[PDB]
Amino acid sequence: HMSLENVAFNVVNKGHFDGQQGEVPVSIINNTVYTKVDGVDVELFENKTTLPVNVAFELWAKRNIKPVPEVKILNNLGVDIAANTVIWDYKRDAPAHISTIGVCSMTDIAKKPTETICAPLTVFFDGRVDGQVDLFRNARNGVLITEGSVKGLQPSVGPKQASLNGVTLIGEAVKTQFNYYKKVDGVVQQLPETYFTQSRNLQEFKPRSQMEIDFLELAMDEFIERYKLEGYAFEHIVYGDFSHSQLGGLHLLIGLAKRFKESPFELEDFIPMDSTVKNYFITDAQTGSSKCVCSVIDLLLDDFVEIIKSQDLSVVSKVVKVTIDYTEISFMLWCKDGHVETFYPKL
Amino acid sequence: GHMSLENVAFNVVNKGHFDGQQGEVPVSIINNTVYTKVDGVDVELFENKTTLPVNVAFELWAKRNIKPVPEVKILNNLGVDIAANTVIWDYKRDAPAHISTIGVCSMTDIAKKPTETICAPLTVFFDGRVDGQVDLFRNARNGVLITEGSVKGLQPSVGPKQASLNGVTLIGEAVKTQFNYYKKVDGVVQQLPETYFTQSRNLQEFKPRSQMEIDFLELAMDEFIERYKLEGYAFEHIVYGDFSHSQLGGLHLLIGLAKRFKESPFELEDFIPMDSTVKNYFITDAQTGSSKCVCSVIDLLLDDFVEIIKSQDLSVVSKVVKVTIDYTEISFMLWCKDGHVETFYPKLQ
Amino acid sequence: GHMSLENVAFNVVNKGHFDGQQGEVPVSIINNTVYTKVDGVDVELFENKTTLPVNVAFELWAKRNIKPVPEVKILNNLGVDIAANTVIWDYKRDAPAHISTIGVCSMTDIAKKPTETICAPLTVFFDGRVDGQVDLFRNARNGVLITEGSVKGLQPSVGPKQASLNGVTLIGEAVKTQFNYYKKVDGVVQQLPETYFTQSRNLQEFKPRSQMEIDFLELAMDEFIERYKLEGYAFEHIVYGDFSHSQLGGLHLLIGLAKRFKESPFELEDFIPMDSTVKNYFITDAQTGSSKCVCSVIDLLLDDFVEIIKSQDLSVVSKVVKVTIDYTEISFMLWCKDGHVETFYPKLQ
Amino acid sequence: GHMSLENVAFNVVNKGHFDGQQGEVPVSIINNTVYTKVDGVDVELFENKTTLPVNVAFELWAKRNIKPVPEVKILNNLGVDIAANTVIWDYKRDAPAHISTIGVCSMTDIAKKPTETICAPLTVFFDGRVDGQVDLFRNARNGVLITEGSVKGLQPSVGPKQASLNGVTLIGEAVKTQFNYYKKVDGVVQQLPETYFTQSRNLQEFKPRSQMEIDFLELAMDEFIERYKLEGYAFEHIVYGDFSHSQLGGLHLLIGLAKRFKESPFELEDFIPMDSTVKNYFITDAQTGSSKCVCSVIDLLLDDFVEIIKSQDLSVVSKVVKVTIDYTEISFMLWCKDGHVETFYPKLQ
Amino acid sequence: HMSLENVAFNVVNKGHFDGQQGEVPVSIINNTVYTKVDGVDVELFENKTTLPVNVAFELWAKRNIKPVPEVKILNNLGVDIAANTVIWDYKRDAPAHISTIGVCSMTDIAKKPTETICAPLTVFFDGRVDGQVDLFRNARNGVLITEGSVKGLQPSVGPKQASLNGVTLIGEAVKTQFNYYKKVDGVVQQLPETYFTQSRNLQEFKPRSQMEIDFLELAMDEFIERYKLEGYAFEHIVYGDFSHSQLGGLHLLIGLAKRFKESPFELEDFIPMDSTVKNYFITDAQTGSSKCVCSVIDLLLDDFVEIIKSQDLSVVSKVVKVTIDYTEISFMLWCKDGHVETFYPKL
DSSP-assigned states of every residue in E300-319: -HHHHHHHHHTS--SSSEEE
How do A327-336 and A339-345 pair as beta strands?
Answer: antiparallel
Q: What are phi and psi of D75, to 5 degrees?
A: -60, -45
Runs of H (alpha helix) within E127-205: 132-138
Closest alpha carbon to E58 in E38, E30, E28, E83: E28
CA distance E298 to E277: 8
Distance (Å, rounded) from C-alpha E317 to C-alpha C296?
88
D120 touches chain C (CB under 8 A): no
In three-state secondary structure terms, E257 is helix
Distance of alpha carbon E90 from alpha carbon D325, whole angstroms: 51
Q: Exposed, middle or buried by CB within 10 Å (0-12, 13-18, 19+), for A191?
A: middle
Strand order in the sheet with D279-285: D266-269, D279-285, D291-297
Q: Are strands C180-185 and C143-147 parallel, antiparallel or unpaired?
A: antiparallel
Q: Which of residues 55-74 of B touch A (CB under 8 A)?
A: 55-56
Residue B38, helix vs strand vs coil? strand
Cα separation, B123 vs B121, whole angstroms: 7
Known binding residue A293? Answer is yes
Radius of gyration of chain D (CA): 24
Q: Is the dihedral of CA B67, B72, B76, B81 positive or negative?
A: positive
Residues of D in contact with C178 (CB under 8 A): none
Residue C21, Cβ density class (10 Å: 0-12 exposed, 13-18 middle, ≥19 buried) = exposed
Q: Please name which of C342, C327, C135 lies closest in space to residue C242, comparing C-alpha atoms.
A: C342
Q: Whole-angstrom distance between the N-terminal and C-terminal Cα of chain A?
A: 51
Q: Which residues of B226-245 are buried (b: 16+ CB within 10 A; e: fewer)?
A: eeeebeebbbbbbbbbebee
* DSSP string computed for D209-261: -SHHHHHHHHS-HHHHHHHTT-TTTTHIIIII-B-SSSBPB---BHHHHHHHH
**Which residues have C-beta within 8 Å of that of residue D132, sequence separation ≥ 6?**
none
Nearest CA in chain E to D51: E52
Of the residues B73, B98, B183, B237, which is catalytic? B237
> What count of Cα atoms within 13 Å lies in the side-chain half-sphere of residue A18?
11
Residue C273 touches chain E, beta carbons under 8 Å: no
Do strands B188-189 and A265-268 pair parallel, antiparallel, or not at all (unpaired)?
A: unpaired
Q: Which of C63, C73, C183, C252 is catalytic?
A: C252
CB of D274 within 8 Å of a chain C CB? The answer is yes
Residue E91: closest CA among E168, E178, E33: E168
Residue E96's identity, in one-letter code, is A
* Under 8 Å between Cβ of E167 and E158: no
Q: Give the three-class secondary structure for E104.
A: coil
Question: Rounded distance, CA B298 to CA A134, Å?
Answer: 79
Question: What are the beta bridge partners of residue B109?
Answer: B101
Asked whether the beta carbons of residue E174 and residue A281 sit closer than 8 angstroms, the reply is no
Rg (C-alpha) for chain B, rounded Å, is 24
Specify the DSSP class assigned to residue D64: B
> B108-115: long-range contacts (C-beta < 8 A, 24 or more apart)?
B108/B52, B108/B56, B108/B60, B110/B82, B114/B84, B114/B85, B114/B140, B115/B139, B115/B140
Inter-chain CB proximity A106 and B55 less than 8 Å? no
Distance CA B320, CA A51 (A): 62
CA distances in angstroms from A334 to A242, A316, A340, A341, listed in the order given: 20, 6, 6, 5
Task: State the pairing for strand pair A142-146/A123-126.
Answer: parallel
Own/partner contacts of E300-304, CB < 8 Å, gap of 24 or more, are E300/E198, E300/E208, E300/E209, E300/E212, E301/E209, E301/E211, E301/E212, E301/E215, E301/E252, E301/E254, E302/E209, E302/E211, E302/E212, E303/E195, E304/E238, E304/E252
One-letter amino acid of C207: K
On whether A343 is known to bind a ligand per the annotation, the reply is yes
Task: Please state, in angstroms and rounded to a whole number, the distance separating the CA atoms of residues C47 and C44.
Answer: 8
Binding residue positions of D for uracil: 292-296, 343-347
| Whole-number Å distance between alpha carbons of C184 and C143 | 5
What residues does A34 pair with on adjacent strands?
A27, A43
From start to end of A127-254, where are the E strands? 142-146, 156-157, 162-164, 167-169, 179-184, 187-188
On the CB side of C285, how many CA atoms lie within 13 Å of its CA?
27
The domain ranges of chain C are: 1-66, 67-192, 193-349
Would you call B327 exposed, middle or buried from its count of C-beta atoms within 10 A (0-12, 13-18, 19+)?
A: buried
Helix %, strand %, coil % for chain C, to 5? 20, 30, 50
Max Cα–Cα distance, chain C, nearest Å: 77
Nearest Cβ partner of C56 from E1, E4, E27? E27
Task: List Cβ neighbours of D307 (8 Å cut-off, separation of 6 or more).
Answer: none
- Rounded CA-CA distance D291/D272 in Å is 18
For the beta carbon of residue E228, count every other beta carbon within 10 angstroms: 10
d(CA D72, CA C47): 24
Q: What is the resolution of this structure in A?
A: 2.6
Q: Distance (Å, rounded) from C-alpha B24 to C-alpha A275?
A: 41
Instruction: Please state, in angstroms and rounded to a whole number, the distance separating the CA atoms of residues E337 and E316.
Output: 8
Query: In A, residues 7-36, which contact E (CB 8 Å cutoff)?
Result: 31
Q: CA dist B267 to A15, A101, B261, C33, Å?
A: 58, 57, 10, 28
User: Are C333 and C318 spatial neighbours (Cβ–Cβ below 8 Å)?
Assistant: yes
One-letter amino acid of C254: L
The CA-atom distances, in angstroms, between A45 and each of A49, B79, E254 are 11, 40, 41
Measure the CA–CA gap between B105 and B61, rounded to whole angstroms: 11
Closest alpha carbon to B28 in A93, E29, A51, C89: A51
Residues in chain B, overall count: 349
Least CA distance to D46: which residue of chain B?
B271
Annotated catalytic residue within C152, C292, C322, C337: C292
Query: H or E segment at B181?
Result: strand B180-185
- Exposure string for B135-146, b = 16+ CB within 10 A, e = fewer: ebbeebebbbbb
Residue type, B238: I
Q: Which one of B97, B267, B274 has the shortest CB-CB distance to D43?
A: B274
The answer for residues whose C-beta is within 8 angstroms of residue D52's C-beta and 6 or more apart is: D60, D95, D96, D99, D108
The answer to whether C201 and C207 are in contact (CB under 8 A) is: yes
User: How many other C-beta atoms can be found within 10 angstroms of the C-beta atom of residue E155?
Assistant: 15
The two beta strands, E187-188 and B95-96, are unpaired
Q: Which uninterrupted H or E stretch holds B47?
A: strand B41-47
The distance of A245 to chain E (nearest Cα, Å) reads: 6
Residue C105 is labelled as binding a ligand: no
Which amino acid is located at B240 in the chain?
Answer: Y
Radius of gyration of chain C (CA): 24
Helix (H, G, I), strand (E, B) or coil at E84: coil
Respond yes or no: is residue C98 known to be catalytic: no
Question: Among D108, D107, D135, D140, which Cα is nearest to D123's?
Answer: D140
Do B340 and B234 form a contact (C-beta atoms < 8 A)? yes
Residues 6+ apart with CB under 8 A from A270: A279, A280, A281, E11, E12, E15, E44
Q: Which DSSP helix (H) or strand (E) runs through E61?
A: helix E53-61
Q: How far is C334 from chain D (nearest CA, A)?
A: 38
Q: D46 φ, ψ to 5°?
A: -165, 135
The closest alpha carbon to D142, from D101, D84, D67, D73, belongs to: D84
- Non-local (6+) Cβ contacts of B198 within 8 A are B73, B277, B298, B299, B300, B325, B326
Report the C-alpha dihedral over residues A73, A76, A82, A85, rounded to 10 degrees: 20
A2 touches chain B (CB under 8 A): yes
Cα D348 from chain centroid (whole Å): 19
- Asked if A236 is an active-site residue, the reply is yes
Q: Which residues of D are catalytic?
A: 237, 252, 292
Does A50 lie at the interface with C, CB-CB under 8 angstroms?
yes
Chain B nearest CA to A27, separation (Å): 6
CB-based contact E52 C28, cutoff 8 Å = yes
- How far CA E86 is from CA of A226, E57, E107, E128, in Å, comes to 50, 12, 11, 15
Which of C166, C200, C201 to substitute to test the interface with D, most D CBs within 10 Å? C166
Handedness of CA E336, E341, E344, E346 (dihedral sign): negative
CA–CA separation, C288 and C249 (whole Å): 13
What approach was used to elucidate this structure? Answer: X-ray
Which positions in chain A touch E172 (Cβ < 8 Å)?
287-288
CB environment C99-114: b (16+ within 10 A), e (fewer): bbbbebbebbeebeeb
Strands C89-90, C95-96: pairing kind: antiparallel
Cβ contact C300:C199 at 8 Å: yes
Q: Is B347 annotated as a binding residue?
A: yes
In angstroms, the CA D51 to CA E52 distance is: 9
CB-based contact D289 C41, cutoff 8 Å: no
What does E184-232 look like in DSSP terms, one character per residue? ETTEE--PPP-B------STT----SHHHHHHHHS-HHHHHHHTT-TTT
Among D37, E278, D53, which residue's Cα sits nearest to residue D45? D37
Q: Which of B345, B324, B322 is nearest to B334 (CA)?
A: B345
Cα–Cα distances in angstroms (integers) from residue C179 to residues C70, C157, C309, D60, in the given order: 8, 9, 28, 55
- For residue B92, give the chain D residue with the closest CA: D43
Q: Report DSSP state, residue C129.
A: T
The dihedral built from the CA positions of residue E244, E245, E251 and E255, taken in this order, carries a sign that is: positive
For residue C10, the chain E residue with the least C-alpha distance is E3
Nearest to B234 by CA among B292, B307, B309, B321: B309
Cβ proximity of E339 and E333 under 8 Å: no
Residue D223 exposure: Cα atoms within 13 Å on the Cβ side: 7
Separation of first and last alpha carbons in chain D: 48
Strand D89-90, strand E142-146: pairing: unpaired
Count of beta carbons in the 10 Å neighbourhood of residue D204: 7
First to last CA, chain C: 48
Q: Name the helix (H) or strand (E) containing E81.
A: strand E81-82
CA B73/CA B169 separation, integer angstroms: 13
Q: Is D92 an interface residue toward C (CB < 8 Å)?
A: no
Contact by Cβ (8 Å): C233, C335:
no
Q: Which of C321, E175, A53, A267 has the alpha carbon at shortest distance from B53?
A: A53
